[PDB]
Amino acid sequence: QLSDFQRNKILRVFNTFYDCNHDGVIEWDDFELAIKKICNLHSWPTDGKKHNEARATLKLIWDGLRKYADENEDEQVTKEEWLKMWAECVKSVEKGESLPEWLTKYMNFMFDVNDTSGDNIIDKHEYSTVYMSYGIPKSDCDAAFDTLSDGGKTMVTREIFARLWTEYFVSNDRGAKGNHLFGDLKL
Numbered sequence: 001q002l003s004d005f006q007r008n009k010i011l012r013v014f015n016t017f018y019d020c021n022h023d024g025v026i027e028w029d030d031f032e033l034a035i036k037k038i039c040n041l042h043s044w045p046t047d048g049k050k051h052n053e054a055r056a057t058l059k060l061i062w063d064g065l066r067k068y069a070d071e072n073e074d075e076q077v078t079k080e081e082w083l084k085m086w087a088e089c090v091k092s093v094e095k096g097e098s099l100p101e102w103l104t105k106y107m108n109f110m111f112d113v114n115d116t117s118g119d120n121i122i123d124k125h126e127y128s129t130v131y132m133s134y135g136i137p138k139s140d141c142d143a144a145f146d147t148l149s150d151g152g153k154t155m156v157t158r159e160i161f162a163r164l165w166t167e168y169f170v171s172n173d174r175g176a177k178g179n180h181l182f183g184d185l186k187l
C-alpha cells in the first residue's frame with residue numbers, strides 16, 4: 001500500500017487542489033469551479049478562447065479520472081475511491097508504467113496556468129500567484145520555489161515541472177525536490 005508519507009501527499013492534493021467546493025468529494029462541479037477561479041485569477045473572459053480550451057481539457061481529465069476511480073458509477077469520486085486508484089497508479093509507475101493520461105493532461109494544464117508569461121518557465125511570482133489562490137502561504141510558496149529551482153540554478157520548464165510532478169505523487173523519499181511542488185512541506 002501507500003506509506004503514510006505517500007497517502008498524506010495524495011490526500012492534500014485531493015482536499016486542497018481537486019475539491020474546489022470543499023464538500024469532501026470530487027465531481028464535475030469541482031472542475032466548473034476550478035475554471036471560474038482561474039478565470040478570476042488571470043482575468044480570462046467567459047466563453048473566450050482560454051476559457052473554452054480549459055473547459056474542453058478539464059472534461060477530458062474528469063472523464064479519465066471518473067473511468068479510473070469511480071467504482072460505483074455515481075459520478076462522484078470519494079477519498080476512498082481516490083486512494084484505491086492511487087495505490088494502483090503508484091505500483092503501476094513502480095513497474096515501469098506511465099501515470100494515467102488524465103493526470104498528465106492535468107499536469108500540463110497546471111503548468112500552463114502557472115506560466116502566464118508563456119516563456120516556458122515558471123518564475124517565483126507566477127508560482128506564488130497560482131499556489132496562493134489555493135491557500136498556500138507566500139513563505140511556503142517561496143521556500144518550495146527555492147527548492148524546485150535549486151535557488152535559481154534550474155529553470156522550471158514544462159519538462160522540469162513534469163518530472164517534479166511525478167515525484168510528488170509517487171516518491172517515498174522525504175528528500176525528493178518534487179515533494180514541494182504544491183507548497184513547502186515541513187519534513
Ligand SMILES: [Ca+2]
Nearest residue numbers: 019023025030
Ligand atoms: Ca467537491
Ligand SMILES: [Ca+2]
Nearest residue numbers: 070072074076
Ligand atoms: Ca463514486
Ligand SMILES: [Ca+2]
Nearest residue numbers: 115117119121
Ligand atoms: Ca513564465
